[PDB]
Design a protein around this ligand. Structure first.
Ligand code: NI
Ligand code: NI
Ligand code: NI
Ligand code: NI
Lengths: 164, 164
């Protein structure tokens, strides 16, 4: 009296799902690395200060969240996910779309020839002490939503290993 | 007479190692998203063309690979890793150190007030049909090295679940 095939499939499934979620979490976290580059140039010894001219960096962030967005779109579709987890996915996807919509709507500010440090922070820096009025707020919401989904996905992996 | 607990620990350890590896592969792949942004502004409908002024975007990529490099430096140190995997990690960390070294070395090209698209491509765009002479070559190497590490890491997870 025991049971292995079903338990094995359950760990495989839960791990496969966590993989997709983890990949999305990494991408979102990575905007924090891009924010460190606001107003920075590559110099002889690493990043040094060279304020402003940030547009293409924000474009980078936008490109990354685009990929997040596309990945979640595809996750939303996976078969055999619990209603629960599908909901947590939708919350992330909504947050991601939100960020992209906000950024687009601030084209005049974020796409101009010289986006100043302050404004770049309002788009992509979650520790921004300024207004978070050009993406940052939406980025915080995304971070909260993906942290929730990842917590759930990893919980399932743990449960599937210990139900062993 | 199989030892549920040793099998369980091995799944857990292999999965935690893959988690770290996977997070590094995603950070490296993300450079491909950033490259899509070279010479693009955020516009009312998404990225649109706005040539050049790419320095801060390259800084972004630089920042991201710093994070990769740091993560691998920590991985290198994990206890209980097989010599084989350790070697596979070293190949990745070497490649990321290489990238940062090359970028730094091309400061006069990459940190100037107007880095043109072509140049940006030679740093951070692995499908660049131009020279790969300011980072791209090293980024391609990094890509190969982490793909190999990831393949190994994921193989171990599947072995660990299958050994079950
Ligand atoms: Ni300057
Ligand atoms: Ni997070
Ligand atoms: Ni322009
Ligand atoms: Ni790859």
């Amino acid at each position: 009296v025991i049971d292995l095939a079903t338990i094995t499939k359950n760990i495989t499934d839960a791990v496969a799902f966590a993989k997709s979620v983890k990949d999305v979490h990494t991408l979102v976290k990575s905007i924090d690395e891009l924010a460190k580059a606001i107003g920075k140039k590559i110099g002889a010894n690493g990043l040094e200060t060279d304020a402003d001219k940030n547009a293409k960096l924000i474009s980078g962030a936008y490109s990354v969240i685009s990929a997040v967005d596309t990945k979640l779109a595809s996750l939303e579709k996976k078969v055999g996910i619990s209603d629960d987890l599908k909901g947590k996915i939708t919350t992330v996807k909504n947050a991601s779309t939100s960020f992209l919509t906000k950024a687009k709507s601030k084209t005049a500010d974020l796409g101009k020839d010289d986006v100043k440090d302050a404004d770049a922070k309002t788009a992509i820096d979650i520790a921004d002490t300024g207004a978070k009025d050009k993406g940052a707020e939406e980025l915080i919401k995304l971070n909260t939503a993906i942290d929730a989904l990842l917590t759930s996905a990893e919980a399932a992996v743990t449960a599937a290993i210990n139900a062993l």
